[PDB]
Design a protein around this ligand. Structure first.
Ligand SMILES: CN(CC1(O)CCOCC1)c1ncnc2[nH]ccc12
Ligand SMILES: [Cl-]
Length: 167
């Protein structure tokens, strides 16, 4: 039993809710919140910009030190950093950005990072300003993640389309 509330159950391990991941994280304080990151951990917009703003830019400060030490992430890769005031840990995961011409096949690799954590609060990788089809992203999530994932979908219209079109 966990403290996630109001989710629809899609499969044995995947749950979904129309919610702002920032407000969700601030309520649940999960062990892991997933950020929709880029390789430079520059959290300017989308989910990343929102999560960082909620940390008063502490996420960006930590991230800049991480990059200065380690260099950029790989597309499809991840790193574990602090969750600041939102969660214990933030798993920064880089899904392919279609608007950069990146290979959508790497979305499966991105979701594989979730399997290293027993429970996660997460957005739909490569959706939003990353340009991928969210219905496809949800499909890959369900077919790749085996640990317990709670998906927060910001847009109510999109949330209704993902449920009603889910196979
Ligand atoms: C922008 N996205 C990503 C999508 O959910 C949007 C619709 O398409 C699927 C991915 C966010 N998701 C959850 N919480 C959020 N808080 C602020 C932004 C945000
Ligand atoms: Cl985003």
């Amino acid at each position: 039993v966990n403290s996630f509330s109001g989710y629809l159950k899609l499969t044995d391990n995947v749950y979904i809710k129309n919610a702002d991941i920032v407000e969700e994280a601030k309520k649940v304080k999960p062990t892991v919140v997933v950020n929709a990151a880029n390789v430079y951990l520059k959290h300017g917009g989308g989910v990343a910009g929102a999560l960082n703003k909620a940390t008063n830019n502490a996420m960006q400060v930590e991230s800049d030190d991480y990059i200065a030490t380690n260099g950029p992430l790989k597309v499809g890769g991840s790193c574990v950093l602090s969750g600041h005031n939102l969660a214990k840990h933030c798993l920064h995961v880089v899904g392919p950005n279609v608007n950069k011409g990146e290979d959508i096949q790497l979305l499966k690799s991105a979701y594989e990072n979730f399997n290293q954590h027993e429970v996660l609060l997460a957005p739909l990788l490569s959706a939003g300003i990353f340009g991928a089809d969210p219905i496809h992203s949800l499909r890959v999530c369900v077919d790749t993640v085996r640990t317990n994932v709670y998906l927060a979908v910001f847009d109510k219209n999109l949330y209704d389309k993902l449920v009603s079109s889910f196979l």
